[PDB]
From a paper:
It is the main protein responsible for receptor binding and fusion, as well as the major target for neutralizing antibodies.
We thoroughly characterized a chimeric virus containing the prM and ectodomain of E (ecto-E) proteins of TBEV in a LGTV genetic background. We determined the structures of LGTV and chimeric LGTVT:prME using cryogenic electron microscopy (cryo-EM) and three-dimensional image reconstruction. There are three occurrences of M in the asymmetric unit. One conformation is identical to LGTV and TBEV, maintaining the pi-stacking interactions between M residues Trp37 at the raft interfaces, as well as the salt bridges between Lys40 and Glu33 of the respective chains, whereas the alternative conformation disrupts these tight interactions. The new models included two extra residues in the C-terminus of the E protein (residues 495 and 496), and the LGTVT:prME model has one more residue in the C-terminus of the M protein (residue 75). The observed attenuation might also be due to sub-optimal interactions between the prM protein from TBEV and the C protein or transmembrane domain of the E protein of LGTV.
Numbering used by the authors:
A (entry chain B), C (entry chain A), E (entry chain C): 1 to 496
B (entry chain E), D (entry chain D), F (entry chain F): 1 to 75
Write the structure that this text describes.
């Protein structure tokens, strides 16, 4: 199970007779779905990508300057003039120099001087924005069954099957081997908002930088650099990287503002990273909402004999997964295809097997098997596999389990926003008021405050609350107290 | 090429690797101590003129608690 | 008369009894001495320099990284460590990877990972500080006698004399041919503060930047960058150009924050430029208090014959200098060594001469002569040179000239500060009141608000005055209105 | 990360070439005006709410200039 | 009868229908079980150990220093720099020495000096910490039947049986010879908290110290000494044992703070001892909870005939055990095997037998037997073995017995904590309340004040009582008096 | 077993080297300034119980200096 490899594991379960479950799948997440009398199944989103997305603006990070010229005119000889003021790709300034007999004029006073320089970009110094097309995005959802066997992060599990999704191809059926068939519906609408998201590329060749950043479109439109669209030979606003010295007699200096006078470091701090792999432009932070059908699934080996109880040995003695579960592996010797007689018991009444098996109906097959995952009540238990027996102490308490499940819940809200309500083995009427309140309040907070920094959002919230205390009208006072407290709480919503 | 704004901390989805970290109040309140402990010197006493100016303990504390996160933040 | 070439010129008047004058000579300025019965002198400060100043810190603006290495150990198997972790010229991070059975560990929990990378500066990307030595600095002062001869800003006056002053130099004499001698003293301790001043050098060969900048020492000594001193092989500050990605199970990626040249050049906005010329490091803003003595000066040619009034012809007709003076050049056809009969008349009253000459006792000599400069009262005038005449309308007013000297005083007092009171042919008791009150009241502002920025100085000054309208006693209200007004008055001049 | 705070502007003796004219009123005034042109809905809400809530013209003028000049500064 | 050799002994009782007893067994403790009609047993914990526990930190108690080197620079000549600053196994400091003409410098002022020395540990001067693995600990429990023969301490008894418990065990069954089988289950988790204990080793070859100490883990992580983990050659924090002299012009002394062994042995005062034996690492404090089942035990010698009442003689006369029991031994000359007619009586009635025997159905064997232990009521008594008669006077009283049995219970509660409620052969309602109150109120005290020093805890308790007397609110007053008393009682119950 | 109390600053050769310079005033002030940043939350309980129970600013200040001077003597 690939689900054991990640810290960000999740579990959701189908009740008696429930044939369908709705999931939200995320690039850094993994869901084990279990339902009564169906094989346990792991589902995750492995990629979101497009090939060769459309270029938008190119921006210049380091100007090259060349072929500077100047012209100047004596007092009352009228304004100085150059051919280069009319061309493309030149930056120029027109200014006045003090003149007199000492610099070969006939009168003392102010002359006129004009200075020019060609502007270009250095060989690999461009920031490029690329934008996704909803008609060509590929999502990629993968499924793995609990085959009762174990694999590393760097091993090829034969039970993994893959399904690509795009707007022309929302549904697919996968054959999981002897475990039967599974049905996936992915809406490729919803998910990442491709209208707001730009993929920013600097230079793929650099040894010690990530290949791209996942930048917001309203920020990217405001970069105060020189800029162009693709194919153009001349740069808009090239004066934004050139400054002109104070004029002296018949000469005037031209200066750069310097190498990498642009986007890297302190501007992009906190932006998600993205990755470029040949033609593919992957996001590396994002999601899809997906419905899984559990009708056509089968459980292997319900016809097998149980093991001869004496003939086991441990291959991996019990350990704690970190997900509030116990994992273990057994070796066996004897008649090959068999059920494993697994159970566990507390210091209460001994007839009660307390183990919830996460691997349903575990087996040893001819080639492999004998891994088990299970969940237990808090406190002191003994775990059994035939005549192998091993004491176990389970951490936490019935209250501690709930506080952890609540924190995971709040975190999914703070990451996903309103789509978080679609995660569940149910879709009952209370989900509609949940999404309705989240749609209104989320839209309101985004509309007013979407570009405001963390600190000024807190200052606004404190101002609203303090004005609410100072207001003489009780209706306005209470509205300012409620809205100020909410603005503070949902500003602070960056974690749990 | 000046006044590239710092990227907003919101609306972009998380749950994968970011480039660096910063600019929340948890970080930003710590930045200005490096000016206050060496340059502010005699002007650290301005807590007294704010305290003696405003009307009551609850209002003096409220204005000082908010001033400390914005008033020294000139750059 | 070199002091006509600059936009900036001053006049000091030596009435009889003035054997010596005190000046504050400045780079980017010139002073003319007009002494009663003695030749007029041009005097100015021409360079401030040292050959090969001492190096202080070198900083690196762009990191080169190589040979990255990583090592990790399983949970409870003890912390990871690697041979580069104790060498010079390496950056390292120690961190806690999450590990478990999927990543080849025996247990699930936090492990240990260590990452290493070498660091160097790219070949041209340094910033080098240099500092002056008061025992080896050279100040250069020049003098040029009013020979009545005009040569352009790009050619050499024969009568121009140089004095080069160090801490060794006493009162020194310059022999000016027939005009006599000028005797001159420069006070090296009464000029630039060499303790607080640093010269900053990036790369000299960059074609479109100035060759050096002048910076304050208590800014240069606390930049957050990698630093070194000359000839050392390794960089000596906990690395600020290198950064470490969040750890995977068995890998951790290193990042380079790139070239800082753009953020440095932005942070230097407002500083004076400097210059480097071979081995010589020049300041291009600065001053020295200097004392000039006149008892050894003579008017040339006071025994010479008068000219033939009829034999003059113009070579360059009367025009305005921009300094409220009239300038001209004349030619003579008679026997050359003689005194020119210059005079000027208010239109309609030929009895009174109104020519205040700046060239005392004008002459023609066999090798050259005939430049004249004078100041005339506003309105209609006639200018004469023998039987030549020309009619001149002098622009301005008596009020406009008093305003111009007022403005020029406030400018020098703003730029040069406390030393500006020492400028003049006098030292009467009022000058001690001025310099004392400037030292105390200006010293209070510099002590209390030194290093506070322009905007926050304005906000604090305006706030202190505005709260001053409603304080609990009229003594405090007045005191905080007066001190708030003083803070704004100092700030809005140049106290940024 | 590297930080290089701007040089103090008035501390050095003038009358020669300075590298650039300082941030002064120019960078501040254009930064403040540019923020009002972007966050239009919030800027209009802030000025109208302050004008409808605070009890004098002088305290309104003070709060309006303070809230404008400290809003865009975090870059 | 091993329970007679020891200063600590507990007695447990039960009716025919009890079948199972729950015990807490302790190192240096001992339990005798006396269920109705069953052969009595002694049970004790003999050892808690692991072979070769894993090393945590090594610490150095005596720094060895060698090959010191020093380098220094004149004022204004920059920092001093030396090769040994960038190696493993060196410690260094830099400082500003005073310099001038008298030590070959051109300027008077603060110079720069750096001093370096190599650091190591002397040959046997380490402390090593060791930690247990819960999967490898062995607990050894021993059982002995009351066979009616006496074997001394420091000689071997044939009837003793050994059970070795590790995390992979359930119930075990020991065949106690002709007395049938005893069934025993150990909970290997809980009681001792193996995550909080470090076995500390200094040097096993030293003749006059314990081989190891049972130190607390939170203390051992905070030792301010040089440290490393196994197999590394360099020491971390070597600057904890070198301290440097004030600098001279071109020299600076290195001083060694010497062997710390004595300071550590003083800091460990009040920590229990531990023992090392070849590969074994024993604790000499700790406890385990066991359930022991009596159902398969057989009474020996119920079928046999009575002895001849006339043919006994004493071997050990009736003597006080110190455990409120009488001990005696008899020799017999009749036919064997046979049953000993033993009884005891009080002067108030010659018919009523008042002997509460500990040895059930005592016998003579063909090659052993003849020892009896019994409890008698207070007052004056006669003990009979056939025609042997011996007077007795039993010390103490019924109220004295109730006190000593209550006192010994408080010793379990203070030494063992919440596990004190598990000790017993039968249930009762107040044991459910007592465990709840102890785990709640003791949990609160350990949460809020746990690690605080003894005198500070008393001062805080006395301050709480002072606040209770002085604060004007009567509800807070009584709450401070009640809570201060509870804090003081639990504090005085652990001491210093 | 053996205990050896280190002696006061009575003997003072005025111009010669000390051994380890355990000069108590500046050292204990440094220890107090460390303790109030490491154990920072506990100062709130100590100041509030004094502020609530003592009936004047004079008697509050008189104990607080002594209490904060005593704080690092215990753990
Ligand atoms: C364990 C008991 C529920 C813990 C919990 O607080 O769970 C919370 C749900 O409840 C709450 O009060 C949420 C309060 C915030 C709204 C997290 O539920 P979830 O992780 O399944 O997220 C999906 C939650 N849907 C099924 C409702 C979509
Ligand atoms: C009581 C609400 C507890 C859950 C919570 O705290 O839900 C928070 C704040 O509550 C609400 O909106 C209340 C209504 C919905 C619940 C949900 O919105 P958010 O903080 O993630 O902001 C928006 C996050 N975008 C920008 C990614 C969309
Ligand atoms: C009133 C105007 C007085 C003449 C003048 O214009 O006086 C100014 C000097 O007073 C001012 O700037 C203050 C003007 C206040 C109005 C020009 O004096 P100055 O060009 O010789 O500069 C150096 C003059 N020290 C040596 C006396 C500083
Ligand atoms: C009241 C005392 C004024 C002294 C003074 O003449 O003040 C002036 C400043 O006048 C003003 O800005 C107001 C000028 C307009 C009237 C000089 O003093 P400063 O400190 O600006 O020195 C000059 C600045 N350096 C020290 C950095 C070279
Ligand atoms: C202090 C040096 C003690 C050396 C020693 O001999 O330490 C041993 C072991 O210390 C301990 O258990 C201390 C436990 C602290 C919790 C002395 O107590 P004990 O062996 O009799 O065990 C305790 C026997 N109860 C249960 C009958 C009293
Ligand atoms: C009397 C001397 C033993 C004190 C002791 O046994 O004190 C406490 C008693 O714990 C309790 O639950 C008392 C509950 C009272 C109600 C345990 O030892 P401790 O926490 O002071 O030391 C650390 C632990 N060692 C000594 C084993 C290393």
């Amino acid at each position: 199970s690939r689900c054991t490899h990640l810290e960000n594991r999740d579990f959701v379960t189908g009740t008696q007779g429930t044939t369908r479950v709705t999931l939200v799948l995320e690039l850094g997440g993994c869901v084990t779905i279990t339902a009564e009398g169906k094989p346990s199944m792991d589902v995750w989103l492995d990629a979101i990508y497009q090939e060769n997305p459309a270029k938008t603006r190119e921006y210049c990070l380091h100007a090259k300057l060349s072929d500077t010229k100047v012209a100047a005119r004596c007092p009352t000889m009228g304004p100085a003039t150059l051919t280069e003021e009319h061309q493309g790709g030149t930056v120029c300034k027109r200014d006045q120099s003090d003149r007199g007999w000492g610099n070969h004029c006939g009168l003392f006073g102010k002359g006129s001087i004009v200075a020019c320089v060609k502007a270009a970009c250095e060989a690999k110094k461009k920031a490029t924005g690329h934008v996704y097309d909803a008609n060509k995005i590929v999502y990629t959802v993968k499924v793995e069954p609990h085959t009762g066997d174990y694999v590393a992060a760097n091993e090829t599990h034969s039970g993994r099957k893959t399904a690509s999704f795009t707007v022309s191809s929302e549904k697919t059926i996968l054959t999981m081997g002897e475990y039967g068939d599974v049905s996936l519906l992915c809406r490729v609408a919803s998910g990442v908002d491709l209208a707001q998201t730009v993929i920013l590329e600097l230079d793929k060749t650099v040894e010690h930088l990530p290949t791209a950043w996942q930048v917001h479109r309203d920020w990217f439109n405001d970069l105060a650099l020189p800029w162009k669209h693709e194919g153009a030979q001349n740069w808009n606003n090239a004066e934004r990287l050139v400054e002109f010295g104070a004029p002296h007699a018949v000469k005037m200096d031209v200066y750069n503002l310097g190498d990498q006078t642009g986007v890297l470091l302190k501007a992009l701090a906190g932006v998600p990273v993205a990755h470029i792999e040949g033609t593919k432009y992957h996001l590396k932070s994002g999601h899809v909402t997906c419905e899984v059908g559990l009708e056509k699934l089968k459980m292997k080996g319900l016809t097998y004999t149980m093991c001869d109880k004496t003939k086991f040995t441990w291959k991996r003695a019990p350990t704690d997964s970190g997900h509030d579960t116990v994992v273990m592996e057994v070796t066996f010797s004897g008649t090959k295809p068999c059920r494993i007689p697994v159970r566990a018991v507390a210091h209460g009444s001994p007839d009660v097997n307390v183990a919830m098996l996460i691997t349903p109906n575990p087996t040893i097959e001819n080639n492999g098997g004998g891994f088990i995952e299970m969940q237990l009540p808090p406190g002191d238990n003994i775990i059994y596999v035939g005549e192998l027996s091993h004491q176990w102490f389970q951490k936490g308490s019935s209250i501690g389990r709930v506080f952890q499940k609540t924190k995971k819940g709040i975190e999914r809200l703070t990451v996903i926003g309103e789509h978080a309500w679609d995660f569940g083995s149910a879709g009952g009427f209370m989900t509609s008021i949940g999404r309705a309140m989240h749609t209104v309040l989320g839209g309101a907070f985004n509309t007013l405050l979407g570009g405001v920094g963390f600190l000024p959002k807190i200052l606004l919230g404190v101002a609203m609350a303090w004005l609410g205390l100072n207001m003489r009208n009780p209706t306005l006072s209470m509205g300012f107290l409620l809205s100020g407290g909410l603005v503070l709480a949902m500003t602070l919503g960056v974690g749990a | 090429s000046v006044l590239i704004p710092s990227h907003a901390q919101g609306e972009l989805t998380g749950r994968g690797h970011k480039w660096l970290e910063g600019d929340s109040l948890r970080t930003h309140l710590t930045r200005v101590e490096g000016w206050v402990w060496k340059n502010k010197l005699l002007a650290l006493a301005m807590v007294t003129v704010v305290w003696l100016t405003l009307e009551s303990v609850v209002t003096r504390v409220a204005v000082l608690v908010v001033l400390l996160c914005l008033a020294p933040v000139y750059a």
